[PDB]
Design a protein around this ligand. Structure first.
Ligand code: ADP
Ligand code: ADP
Lengths: 394, 394
């Protein structure tokens, strides 16, 4: 009974899951938080947080490695999957990790400094601790590499693109890829002749247009800051406005970089919380700013969903996914009602069902476009890639 | 036979037109360019440029005033219309100019430094030269004041909005207003129950969603730099990307402000010209970058047109206007073909007709949405407002 160890190293954390190769089910999950801090810990399934105080990425993973051995899981780990934030234009699909891949990942890392280097730290650690184990790299950007130039180019001088690599990349690639595959099943669509819009709505949020199985447009840009307004991220924002704000408050780009990434979006408008649940209750209790934050959030989602549909020859479905897309009854309803122009019809009773109902259709029959909620499973998608690559002769 | 003198003062020019109150036809037009420069001139209808060397906004208008007197037009000027770039949240409609209006215009001027002060210079000059003449102010932003908060708010901290006035304003207001009024006629639509998308495509470009006669979404933002990619303007651009570019080339925001306003868009991508005509020929001749610039330009227009449609309850028509929208056969075709998802059907023979054919429908019957070209006439719209206001008792 082989298992797949899936890893995701962030700037200050290391999330992991152990999936059964046979059923792709989670057998164990955990997270080492407070990384590089004088006080780091490891909590597995909730079990009392261990003391990983003063430990680097490798020790943290060494601790996680011991927790797998203390549960006789070590010997059944046949594959390891690493989630990589940015793959530049070098990676269009998941790959078996070798020295060349590591080199390539370093090459594109300048494009995602705050994430890629942590991803690499994770790779080095895993390689040290599981030498005889095949390891795979899954890039959050690879699914969007099918985008045409007209869809990934910015209106900046050509030089910025050709010599600096400035262009739209998009993220949530693994989710958008996974969810759209699931959609062809659920909606009984022919992948080769289909038009889908996936709305990945989490604390990080993005839209993706999948035409005939391929991503043809996505909302995030060179960085995860473009597109939809999010939990603490601003989303699209007039550069002239950002420039004006700079001259008025005497702030630098790093100051504004912080504001737009940490103090904006839902948090910034509501001045209350980045958490939707908190905001939904706030609205219910009469909080005006919480209502404006949500309304704005919904307005921008509807706008991009419609905008992205322009890259499809035909619109067959709109799929909601992510923590927010899977659990927010109201947001889904508001977004959908904001898209009546596309002929969407919601089945409120179906939309009311909690996420325990899994992959489900929430639109009524008269609906011109099918609407559904499909829980995303990036760990499973990564494992499936690893399993496939596990049959290769490298 | 009274006439209306219409003025538009830019940072370095003063465009003017004299329309007949009876037919709203242009009887004279001109432009004083090279303002504040050691060499300024005044060209009327093409007539040899006069020597306005070393002259401020008032002298330039004094020269224009003499050209109207030298043609016995002075005594028939019953109204003067001033085009104002930015009206903030203070102006929702055109107004008769008084001391209060001037004060108010100064209040919002910080929002458009490079345009509003020139507009005010024009007002002071005109007021000096035509004391007994009623004068009106028409704001490029007023038509978009009907936008809901969810549509004009940015995902920035609430403070930036409430204390600094940072929000979407939108421009091309007079064109969008004028063109949509014309559309209800041409398309035989009931203003009170209608959904239109107007694509104002000139060297400056923006989209506007008009629901039941009111603007409910527009593409430009606090400044004319947001939205569509334009002649030399970038249009939407990932702020994280702009930040990244800053740290890589060691440029400031003023440096980037310049790049995004002067060296980007069509010019930036093609590295050839900002002029569509030049680019269309370049493409025909095999120029790849010119083709990419146009394709990108078209892709972004289609995206925003679809995105803006989300603010409509029903999509009745898409109207093209502006120098590009009125004369570009190819761009209109490409944009429309990029919107097949909305069920649009183009009548190529109708779309081929030159702008001399005026207000015209270019979509075929099977089309779910009517498409048309409606030449814009901002001077006429301004005159109509002035004429209406000419009956007021101030
Ligand atoms: N029942 C719910 N109703 C509304 N929002 C919810 C609900 N459950 C979770 N959320 C929101 O979803 C967000 C976090 O999503 P995230 O976990 O990052 O997505 P993913 O689960 O795809 O990785 C939070 O804003 C959270 O408050
Ligand atoms: N026949 C044409 N085909 C393609 N583009 C054209 C044509 N005529 C003018 N243009 C373009 O339209 C643009 C300038 O538009 P503009 O004059 O600012 O709009 P408006 O006339 O609404 O004020 C230029 O890029 C120009 O090359």
């Amino acid at each position: 009974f082989p298992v797949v160890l899936v890893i995701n190293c962030g700037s200050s954390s290391i999330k992991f899951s152990v999936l059964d190769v046979a059923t792709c089910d989670v057998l164990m999950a955990g997270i080492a938080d407070g990384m590089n801090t004088e006080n780091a810990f490891l909590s597995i399934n909730g079990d009392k947080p261990i003391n990983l105080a003063h430990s680097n990425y490798e020790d943290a993973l060494k601790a996680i490695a011991f927790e797998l051995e203390k549960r006789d899981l070590t010997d059944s780990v046949a594959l390891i999957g690493h989630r990589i934030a940015h793959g530049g234009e070098l990676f269009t699909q998941s790959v078996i990790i070798t020295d060349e891949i590591i080199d390539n990942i370093r090459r594109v890392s300048p494009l995602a400094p705050l994430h890629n280097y942590a991803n690499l730290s994770g790779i080095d650690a895993a390689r040290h601790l599981f030498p005889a184990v095949r390891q795979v790299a899954v890039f959050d950007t690879s699914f969007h590499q099918t985008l045409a130039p007209e869809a990934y180019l910015y209106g900046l001088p050509w030089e910025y693109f050709s010599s600096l690599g400035v262009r739209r990349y998009g993220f949530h690639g693994t989710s958008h890829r996974y969810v759209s595959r699931r959609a062809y099943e659920l909606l009984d669509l022919d992948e080769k002749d289909s038009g889908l819009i996936v709305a990945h709505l989490g604390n990080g949020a993005s839209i993706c247009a999948v035409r005939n199985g391929q991503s043809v447009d996505t909302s995030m840009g060179m960085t995860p800051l473009e597109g939809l307004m999010m939990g603490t991220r601003s989303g699209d924002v007039d550069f002239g406005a950002m420039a004006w704000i700079a001259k008025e408050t005497g702030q630098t780009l790093s100051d504004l970089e912080r504001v737009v990434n940490k103090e904006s979006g839902l948090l910034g408008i509501s001045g209350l919380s980045s958490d939707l649940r908190v905001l939904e209750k706030a609205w219910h209790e009469g909080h005006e700013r919480a209502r404006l934050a949500i309304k704005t959030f919904v307005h921008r989602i509807a706008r991009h969903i419609a905008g992205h549909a322009a890259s499809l020859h035909r619109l067959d479905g709109i799929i909601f996914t992510g923590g927010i897309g899977e659990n927010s009854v109201l947001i889904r309803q508001l977004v959908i009602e904001h898209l009546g122009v596309l002929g969407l019809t919601l089945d409120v009773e179906m939309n009311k069902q909690p996420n325990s109902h899994g992959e489900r259709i929430i639109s009524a029959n008269p609906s011109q476009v099918i609407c559904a909620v499909i829980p995303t499973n990036e760990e499973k998608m990564i494992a499936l890639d690893a399993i496939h690559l596990g049959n290769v002769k490298a």
